[PDB]
Amino acid sequence: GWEVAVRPLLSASYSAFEMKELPQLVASVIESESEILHHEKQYEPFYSSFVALSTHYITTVQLQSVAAACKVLIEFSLLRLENPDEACAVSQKHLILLIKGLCTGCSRLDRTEIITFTAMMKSAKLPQTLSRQKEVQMNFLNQLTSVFNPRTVASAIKTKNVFIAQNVASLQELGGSEKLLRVCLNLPYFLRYINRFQDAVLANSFFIMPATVADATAVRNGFHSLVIDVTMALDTLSLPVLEPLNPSRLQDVTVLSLSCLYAGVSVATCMAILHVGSSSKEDDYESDAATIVQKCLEIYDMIGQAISSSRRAGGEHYQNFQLLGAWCLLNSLFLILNLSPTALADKGKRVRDILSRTGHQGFGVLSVILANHAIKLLTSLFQDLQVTDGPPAALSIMAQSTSIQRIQRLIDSVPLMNLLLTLLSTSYRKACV
Amino acid sequence: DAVLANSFFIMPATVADATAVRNGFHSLVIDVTMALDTLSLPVLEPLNPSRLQDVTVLSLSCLYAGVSVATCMAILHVGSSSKEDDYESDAATIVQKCLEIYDMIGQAISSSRRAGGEHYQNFQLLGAWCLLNSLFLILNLSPTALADKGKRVRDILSRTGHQGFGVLSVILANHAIKLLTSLFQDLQVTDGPPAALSIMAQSTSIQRIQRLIDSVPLMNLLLTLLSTSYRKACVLQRQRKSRKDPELFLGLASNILNFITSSMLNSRNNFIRNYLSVSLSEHHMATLASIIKEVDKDGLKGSSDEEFAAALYHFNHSLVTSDLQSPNLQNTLLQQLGVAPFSEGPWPLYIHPQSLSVLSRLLLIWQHKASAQGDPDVPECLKVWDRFLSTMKQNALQGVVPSETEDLNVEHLQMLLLIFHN
Numbered sequence: 001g002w003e004v005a006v007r008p009l010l011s012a013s014y015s016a017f018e019m020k021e022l023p024q025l026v027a028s029v030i031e032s033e034s035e036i037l038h039h040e041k042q043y044e045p046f047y048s049s050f051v052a053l054s055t056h057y058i059t060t061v062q063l064q065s066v067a068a069a070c071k072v073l074i075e076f077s078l079l080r081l082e083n084p085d086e087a088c089a090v091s092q093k094h095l096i097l098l099i100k101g102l103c104t105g106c107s108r109l110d111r112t113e114i115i116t117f118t119a120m121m122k123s124a125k126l127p128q129t130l131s132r133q134k135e136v137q138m139n140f141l142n143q144l145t146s147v148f149n150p151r152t153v154a155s156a157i158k159t160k161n162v163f164i165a166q167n168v169a170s171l172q173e174l175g176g177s178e179k180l181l182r183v184c185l186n187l188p189y190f191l192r193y194i195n196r197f198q199d200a201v202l203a204n205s206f207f208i209m210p211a212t213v214a215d216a217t218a219v220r221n222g223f224h225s226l227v228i229d230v231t232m233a234l235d236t237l238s239l240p241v242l243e244p245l246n247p248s249r250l251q252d253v254t255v256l257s258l259s260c261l262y263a264g265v266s267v268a269t270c271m272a273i274l275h276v277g278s279s280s281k282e283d284d285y286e287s288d289a290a291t292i293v294q295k296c297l298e299i300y301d302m303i304g305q306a307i308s309s310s311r312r313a314g315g316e317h318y319q320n321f322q323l324l325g326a327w328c329l330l331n332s333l334f335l336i337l338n339l340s341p342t343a344l345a346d347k348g349k350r351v352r353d354i355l356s357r358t359g360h361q362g363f364g365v366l367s368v369i370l371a372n373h374a375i376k377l378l379t380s381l382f383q384d385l386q387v388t389d390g391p392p393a394a395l396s397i398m399a400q401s402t403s404i405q406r407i408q409r410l411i412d413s414v415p416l417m418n419l420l421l422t423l424l425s426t427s428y429r430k431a432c433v
Numbered sequence: 434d435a436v437l438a439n440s441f442f443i444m445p446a447t448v449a450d451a452t453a454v455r456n457g458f459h460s461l462v463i464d465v466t467m468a469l470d471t472l473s474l475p476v477l478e479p480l481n482p483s484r485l486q487d488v489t490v491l492s493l494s495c496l497y498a499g500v501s502v503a504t505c506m507a508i509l510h511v512g513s514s515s516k517e518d519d520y521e522s523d524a525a526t527i528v529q530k531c532l533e534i535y536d537m538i539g540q541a542i543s544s545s546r547r548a549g550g551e552h553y554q555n556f557q558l559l560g561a562w563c564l565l566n567s568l569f570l571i572l573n574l575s576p577t578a579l580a581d582k583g584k585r586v587r588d589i590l591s592r593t594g595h596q597g598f599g600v601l602s603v604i605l606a607n608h609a610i611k612l613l614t615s616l617f618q619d620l621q622v623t624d625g626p627p628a629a630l631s632i633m634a635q636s637t638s639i640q641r642i643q644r645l646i647d648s649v650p651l652m653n654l655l656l657t658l659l660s661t662s663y664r665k666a667c668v669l670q671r672q673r674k675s676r677k678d679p680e681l682f683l684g685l686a687s688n689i690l691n692f693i694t695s696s697m698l699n700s701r702n703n704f705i706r707n708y709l710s711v712s713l714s715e716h717h718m719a720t721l722a723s724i725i726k727e728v729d730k731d732g733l734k735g736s737s738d739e740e741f742a743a744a745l746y747h748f749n750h751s752l753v754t755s756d757l758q759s760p761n762l763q764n765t766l767l768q769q770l771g772v773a774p775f776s777e778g779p780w781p782l783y784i785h786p787q788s789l790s791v792l793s794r795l796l797l798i799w800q801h802k803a804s805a806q807g808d809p810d811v812p813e814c815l816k817v818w819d820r821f822l823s824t825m826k827q828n829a830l831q832g833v834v835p836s837e838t839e840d841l842n843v844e845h846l847q848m849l850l851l852i853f854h855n
Contacts, residue, residue, distance in 0.1 A: 144797055147750045151743060152695045172622075173701075244622050311619060314549010384546060387479050 002126050005032075009053045010130075013118045017057045022066075025054060027135050029069040036076060039127075045089035046124035049117045051076055052090050055098050056114060059106035063150075063162065064142050070102055071170035078176050081183055089120050092183075093232050099176075100235050103167050105160065168240060177241035181249070184236050185256060189229050193266070194259040201395050206331035206351045206413075210270040213277035213345070219270050223288045226263065230295040233260065237302055245312040247398060254397045257303035258324055264296030265332040268366040272336050276362050277345060293366055297373060300325060319384065320397045323406045326377035327395065327413055329370055334414050336362055337422055351414075360426045371423055381406060435497075436630050441566035441586045441648075445505040448512035448580070454505050458523040461498065465530040468495065472537055480547040482633065489632045492538035493559055499531030500567040503601040507571045511580060511597050528601055532608060535560060554619065555632045558641045561612035562630065562648060564605055569649050571597060572657055586649075595661045600675050603685050606658055610692050616641060617696035620705070639704060652712045655689055660720050662686040663741075667727060670734070683737045687744040694744070698751040710757045715765045722769035725749070729785035746787065753794050763795055774813040779824040782840035793848045800855045814852050821849065 005028040008021035029036075039047060055073050058066065077095045084092050097108035122131040153165045185194075200207050210216040233256075242253065271289045304325075308318045331351055339345070341359045385403035392409030393401035410416060435442050445451040468491075477488065506524045539560070543553045566586055573589060574580070574597050620638035627644030628636035645651065666682035675681065697709055728742060752758060758766075767773040770788050771781060774796075784792065796814060803811050828840070835841075 141801065144794070144801065145754065147747070147754050149747075151747070152691065152699075311550040311554065314551060315546040316549065318549075319546065 002128055003130070006050060006121070006130070009050070009057065010118075010121070012057060013053070013114070017060060019061075022058075023062065023135060023139075025057075026065045026069045027138065029054060029072055030065065030138075033072055035127075036072070037079065041085070041087055042125070043127050044085065044087055045120060046126070048080070048089035049120045049124065052094070052098065052109075052117050053114065053121070055102055056106075056109050059101050062139070063166070064146065064148050065139060066163070067148075067166040067170060068142070070167050071173070074099060074102065074167070074171050074176070075174055078174055078179055082179055089117070089124075093228060096232050096235050099171070100239060103164060103171065103239060171239075171241075177244070180236050180239070180241050181252060181256075184233055185252060187229055187233075189225055190233075190256075190259060190263065193263045194255060197255070197259045197262045200262075204395075206328075206335065208266055208269045208332065208335055210266070210273045212349050213273065214349075216270045216273045216277070219266075220274070220285060223267070223285065223292070226267070227288055227292055227295075230260065230263070230292055230299070234295055234299050234302075237299060242306050243310070245307070245310045250307075250313055250317065250397055253303060253307070254321060254324070257300050258328065260296050260299045261325060261328055264293045265328060265370070267292050268370060269332065269336055271366060272339060272362045272364060273345075275364065276339055276341060289366065293369065297369070316400065317397050319381075319403075319406065320393075320399060320401075322377050322380055323393065323409070324395060324397070326374060326381060327410060329374035329377065330410065330414050330416070330419070333367070333370060333374060333423065334419055336367060337419070337426065360429070363426055363430055367423075368427070371427075381410075439630075441563070441570065443501055443504045443567065443570055445501070445508045447584050448508065449584075451505045451508045451512070454501075455509070455520060458502070458520060458527070461502070462523055462527055462530075465495065465498070465527055465534070469530050469534050469537075472534060477541050478545070480542070480545050485542075485548055485552065485632055488538060488542070489556060489559070492535055492556075493563065495531050496535045496560060496563055499528045500563060500605070502527050503605060504567065504571050506601060507574060507597045507599060508580075510599065511574055511576060524601065528604065532604070551635065552632055554616075554638075554641070555634055555636075557612050557615055558628065558644070559630060559632070561609060561616060562645060564609035564612065565645065565649050565651070565654065568602070568605060568609060568658065569654050571602060572654070572661065595664070598661055598665055600681070603662070603681055606662075606685055607688065610689055614692050614696055616645075617692075617700070617705075620702060621696075621700060639702075642705070646708065650712065652709070653714070653717075655693060656717050656720060659686050659689050660724065662689075663724060663727070667731070680735075680737045683741050687737075687741045690741075690744045690748050694748045694751050698748070698755055698757075706757065710759075713758060713762060715762060718762055718766040719769050721749070722766060725770065725787050725791075726785075729787050742787075746790070749787070749791050750794060753791060754798070767792065767795070774817045776820070779827065780817070780820040782821075782824065782828075782835075782845065783838060783842055784845050786844070789844060789848065796848075796852060797855075800852065804855065814855075818849070818853070 005025075008018075008025055012018065012021060036047060036051075051073055054069075055077075058070065058073075077099050080088060080090075081092055081095050081099075084095075090098070094109070094113065101108040122129075124130060149165075150162065153162055196207055210219055242249075245253070267289050271286065304318065304321055307313050307321055308315075335351060335354075337360070338354060339362045341361055381403065385407055390405060392412050393399065393405035395409075445454060477484075480488070502524050506521065539553065539556055542548045542556055543550075570586060570589075572595070576594055576596055616638065620642055625640060625643075627647050628634060628640035630644075662682040663686045666679040666686065669677075669679040669682070673679070697705060700706060724745065728745060731738075733739070733742075753763075764773065764775075768776070770792070772784060772788060772792050796817075799811050800814060803809075828835075
């Protein structure tokens with residue numbers, strides 16, 4: 001039965017996990033494998049919560065069976081992250097943290113959620129409401145059929161290392177890298193940012209629309225979903241799912257990272273506009289803006305590091321990545337520093353229109369952070385340049401160009417010297433004030 | 434010329450030509466030292482395509498020179514004071530400096546902001562190609578037959594005792610195995626042309642590995658190095674009771690075996706598994722059986738022996754379990770081991786642990802497959818039980834008291850009982 005199968009988790013929910021309770025849990029997970037992936041709607045939350053508790057208790061601490069069970073759970077979480085159904089007891093975010101935790105040292109789930117998971121455990125109805133020789137022979141057959149590594153990869157650290165190696169091998173076997181990247185690309189909230197980046201790169205111009213103060217407020221009040229999305233995307237990108245950098249995979253990765261940087265730039269512009277136009281809610285808003293911009297920069301840096309060190313993408317792609325990042329950051333800085341105090345802000349109730357048509361109470365910590373990252377990209381590019389008036393370097397990761405072409409494209413986008421002197425003056429004035 | 438002709442050239446030629454190439458080793462030493470010092474300066478950063486071509490030309494030619502001096506020293510040793518000691522020290526120094534130059538150039542290419550992963554892959558491919566061709570050439574040296582009758586690699590392949598080898602061979606094999614494991618780990622994550630041997634070429638990992646296979650039959654070469662290295666290590670260990678120590682050769686053997694297990698046996702790719710299934714031969718099983726007999730007869734000796742035993746155990750069981758060897762190959766292995774289920778002599782009542790492990794693994798796999806499919810009882814198990822009973826009955830009739838290492842260790846009895854239960 002299933003009641004006796006879930007009994008060890010019910011007993012252990014009030015304590016740690018007894019060592020003697022693990023092998024039968026593994027046996028039950030392997031035995032029901034044929035059914036776990038195929039279920040009706042009303043049993044689904046029960047099985048989701050059971051999987052959550054099982055994974056949690058496995059990660060808190062014969063290796064072949066554990067690896068098989070972990071592979072089964074990873075497969076379950078994978079197709080649960082692909083489909084996700086409305087009535088899933090565990091949302092997509094906790095599935096992402098669970099998959100990460102099985103590949104790491106179990107520092108994702110918290111008690112505040114497993115209490116609700118056990119409550120749902122009790123409140124859910126069984127499939128068949130919750131409110132020695134056979135196992136040895138199976139283990140013998142499992143050890144006989146396949147050979148565990150062991151040494152191809154003090155005691156606690158090596159057991160943890162082999163556990164992580166087995167788990168990541170199982171994850172890669174299912175091809176979860178492509179599925180995770182696909183699920184991260186077609187997010188319901190990053191979609192607008194990705195589309196905006198596509199239009200900006202196609203039209204050669206830079207777009208930001210916090211627009212007026214009212215539009216800035218409208219963009220606000222939905223910031224918490226953006227925080228959740230950026231956190232989950234960062235956790236997904238922290239997993240080793242990026243190694244086979246095919247050209248299409250490269251394009252997808254740069255699209256995702258650059259759109260995330262675009263989102264950070266946009267929230268920075270929104271906060272600056274709000275401050276120019278002008279409790280606990282405002283403090284929450286500013287803390288959330290700081291968190292999202294920091295996470296966006298972290299994602300950008302992680303993607304850049306992955307691109308630079310990869311054995312399929314080399315120096316040219318890293319240079320193009322740095323050029324795109326610097327272009328976005330510099331255009332953003334020019335836009336935010338061109339904000340009027342009251343004139344254009346009130347009369348408004350792009351960068352090409354601003355250039356065609358052509359008080360520094362904006363700025364802030366976000367502006368400083370963006371300027372620092374832009375200056376790092378710029379010094380890297382200029383150090384590269386140091387060692388025929390052609391076209392500006394194409395804004396694609398697969399393009400070929402020289403350093404002079406990239407610098408000339410940056411100059412064509414924005415007058416750099418005047419901009420730099422403007423930020424220097426404004427920053428010193430703010431510091432002295 | 435070698436890259437243009439798709440072939441590999443080394444001409445130490447005979448002993449006289451080897452001596453003629455020698456006696457000029459001091460100039461080569463001074464040249465490699467000055468080249469290494471020049472390459473140590475920061476004068477490599479702007480890697481234009483032409484500069485890349487020049488750098489790879491220089492580094493690969495230096496590696497070629499190290500390979501050539503290694504071949505010359507090996508030929509001199511096969512053919513056969515302070516001068517000889519100076520010559521061997523010079524050879525060691527020049528090969529070490531050549532390897533250092535190659536590694537420095539490779540690291541510079543990998544970390545450069547103008548040359549990326551593809552160029553590093555091509556660099557590794559060229560290095561591995563040169564190293565493997567050199568190893569094949571040196572390990573195919575004849576003792577006296579072709580050496581005296583001679584008074585390339587394509588002619589050798591067209592026309593088709595191991596007192597050569599040495600420390601230089603071990604170092605070259607180690608570097609080649611490092612390049613090979615890097616390339617195969619790259620592969621892991623349409624029968625086209627082999628990958629071009631140019632630093633600017635575009636190719637997939639399958640293409641590079643297939644080019645390496647085309648140049649030299651890899652599996653036979655690797656097994657030959659494993660066998661020769663273990664033989665030299667065991668001979669040196671017997672004589673004892675860098676060259677004077679046997680742990681180096683034992684480590685090389687363990688490393689090559691571990692490479693074979695991790696990169697090929699556990700590989701998921703279909704093409705490499707097909708190649709492994711095609712390229713396994715009965716002579717390889719005979720060599721493996723002789724290695725097993727040596728390791729079980731010698732017994733536990735030292736820590737390096739423990740590591741080599743672990744590697745051999747892992748290789749044996751991975752080969753047995755992962756369904757590449759055809760059944761006749763398994764029968765050949767058992768027959769060579771002397772524990773063939775269809776033999777006619779008395780059943781050996783004492784089985785050494787390694788042979789017992791492999792035999793039990795094979796028999797239990799057969800029994801499990803037969804039970805799962807529905808086949809009636811496998812004739813091999815019935816035959817082994819019958820032969821055990823007949824031998825034991827004969828010994829009972831003769832009233833013979835065996836020795837402590839002669840009949841019926843306990844693990845053998847447990848294994849037979851487990852067979853009986855199924």
